[PDB]
C-alpha cells in the first residue's frame, strides 16, 4: 500500500533549493489602497529627477 | 477552601480585580504608528476628572487634564458637579488642549471614553461631550442621549437643551422650594444664600464663566504648600515599616 | 501573531559594528569585528599551597 521508503533520497538528488528571492517583489496581493497611491508616487518622483536634477 | 483550590485558580488583572477598568471595552479603544487619543471623563463625589490620554505600552501618556476645582478660578464656586459644571469642564479641556497644538488642519478628533457609567439619556456624562464639541474638538456623537430627547419621535428640543447648560433645572428648583418649606430650602443651597445668589442670577454667572474659559485656559498651577520633601517627611511618621529577621525569630 | 527576538539582537550588533569602526578610524588600530568560536585555553600555573589534593580510592561498594 503506502510507504515513504526511498523518498527522501530522491529529493536530495537534485537538491532542495530556495525561491531565489528577487528584488522588487510583485505587488499583486498587497492591499490595493497602498497600490493605488504607490502608482502616483512613482509617477511624480521620476518627473522631478528628470526635470530638476540634470 | 482546600490547598489544591488556591493553587489552581489564576487571578484576574490588577486593574480588573480592583474593578476600575473593563478590558473588553479597552481593547476596542486602544488598537486603532499613529497615536490614538481618547477623552477620559470620570465622576467622583464632589469632583470631575477630564483627561486627554494617548496609548503606549509603557502604560499611558496624558496631554491635557482639567478638573472641577479649577472652576472657582473661573467664577463657578457652587454646584461643581452638576450638568453645567460638567459642560464648562468639557469646554475647558477643549480650549486647553487646542492651544498647545496651535489650532485655536481639519478638525482635531478625540474619542469619548466613559468607563462604567451606564448609558442613560440626560446623563451628566454627555455634558462634557457637548462642551467638547462646542469647544472645537471633533467628538463624533449623536443627539440621542442629550436631555430633551423624545422617546416618542426623533425630535431634540434645543430650547430645553440650552436650559440645562445654564443650570435651568437648578434655577427652577430654587423656585419650587421658595414657596414650599424654607426648612428644606435653608438646608440645601446654603452656600447660595450665604452669598445671596438667587435663582435668576445663576444664569448670568455661567454666561460670564464661558467667556473667561475661552479667554484664559493657560492653567497656572496651584503654587504650593511647604515643599515636595516637607510633605514627604511628615508622611513618614504615620506609616509603619517592615520587620527584620531576628526580631521575628525571637518572637 | 508573533514577534522575533534573534533578528532584533542582530540589529543591535550592527550598531556595535559602527562604533568600533568609527573609533578605530580615529586612533590607528586594528578592528577585529568578526566573531570567533570558542578557543582552547592557555597555560596557567596552578598553586596547590592552599588546598592539598585529596585521594579518592573508589571503594564504596
Amino acid at each position: 500500500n503506502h510507504t515513504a521508503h526511498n523518498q527522501t533520497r530522491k529529493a536530495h538528488r537534485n537538491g532542495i533549493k530556495k525561491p531565489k528571492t528577487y528584488k522588487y517583489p510583485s505587488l499583486k496581493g498587497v492591499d490595493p489602497k497602498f497600490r493605488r497611491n504607490h502608482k502616483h508616487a512613482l509617477h511624480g518622483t521620476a518627473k522631478a529627477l528628470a526635470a530638476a536634477k540634470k | 477552601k482546600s490547598s489544591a483550590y488556591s493553587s489552581r485558580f489564576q487571578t484576574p488583572f490588577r486593574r480588573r480585580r480592583e474593578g476600575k477598568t473593563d478590558y473588553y471595552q479597552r481593547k476596542r479603544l486602544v488598537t486603532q504608528n499613529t497615536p490614538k487619543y481618547r477623552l477620559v471623563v470620570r465622576f467622583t463625589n464632589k469632583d470631575i476628572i477630564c483627561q486627554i490620554i494617548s496609548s503606549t505600552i509603557t502604560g499611558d501618556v496624558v496631554l491635557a487634564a482639567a478638573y472641577s476645582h479649577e472652576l472657582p478660578r473661573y467664577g463657578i464656586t457652587h454646584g461643581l458637579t452638576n450638568w453645567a459644571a460638567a459642560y464648562a469642564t468639557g469646554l475647558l479641556i477643549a480650549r486647553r488642549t487646542l492651544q498647545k497644538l496651535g489650532l485655536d488642519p481639519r478638525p482635531f478628533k478625540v474619542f469619548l471614553d466613559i468607563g462604567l457609567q451606564r448609558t442613560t439619556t440626560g446623563a451628566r456624562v454627555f455634558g462634557a461631550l457637548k462642551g467638547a464639541s462646542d469647544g472645537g474638538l471633533y467628538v463624533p456623537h449623536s443627539e440621542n442621549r442629550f436631555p430633551g430627547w423624545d422617546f416618542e419621535t426623533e425630535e431634540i428640543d434645543p430650547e430645553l437643551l440650552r436650559s440645562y447648560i445654564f443650570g435651568g433645572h437648578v434655577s427652577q428648583y430654587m423656585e419650587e422650594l421658595a414657596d414650599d418649606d424654607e426648612e428644606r430650602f435653608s438646608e440645601l443651597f446654603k452656600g447660595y444664600l450665604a452669598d445671596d445668589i438667587d435663582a435668576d442670577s445663576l444664569e448670568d454667572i455661567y454666561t460670564s464663566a464661558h467667556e473667561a474659559i475661552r479667554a484664559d485656559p493657560a492653567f497656572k498651577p496651584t503654587e504650593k504648600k511647604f515643599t515636595k520633601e516637607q510633605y514627604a517627611a511628615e508622611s513618614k511618621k504615620y506609616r509603619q515599616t517592615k520587620l527584620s529577621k531576628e526580631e521575628r525569630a525571637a518572637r | 501573531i508573533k514577534h522575533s527576538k534573534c533578528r532584533q539582537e542582530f540589529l543591535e550588533r550592527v550598531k556595535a559594528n559602527a562604533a568600533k569602526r568609527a573609533e578605530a578610524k580615529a586612533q590607528g588600530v586594528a578592528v577585529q569585528l568578526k566573531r570567533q568560536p570558542a578557543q582552547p585555553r592557555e597555560s596557567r600555573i596552578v598553586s596547590t599551597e592552599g588546598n592539598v589534593p585529596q585521594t579518592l580510592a573508589p571503594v564504596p561498594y
Partner: protein, 49 residues
C-alpha cells in the same frame, strides 16, 4: 556523518587533512568519531608529510 566527512575533504579511505580546533570543528569530529582516528601531530610528522 557522510556529509560531514565530505566537508573535511576526506573522501577516500586512508586520507588526511589538518583541522583547526574550535568549538565548531570539535563537534564535527564528534559526529564522525566511529570512522576517523585523530590526534595531535608533532613537528616531525608535519615536516615529513
Amino acid at each position: 556523518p557522510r556529509k560531514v566527512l565530505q566537508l573535511l575533504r576526506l573522501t577516500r579511505i586512508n586520507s588526511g587533512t589538518f583541522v583547526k580546533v574550535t568549538k565548531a570543528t570539535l563537534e564535527l569530529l564528534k559526529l564522525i568519531e566511529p570512522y576517523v582516528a585523530y590526534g595531535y601531530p608533532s613537528y616531525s610528522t608535519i615536516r615529513q608529510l
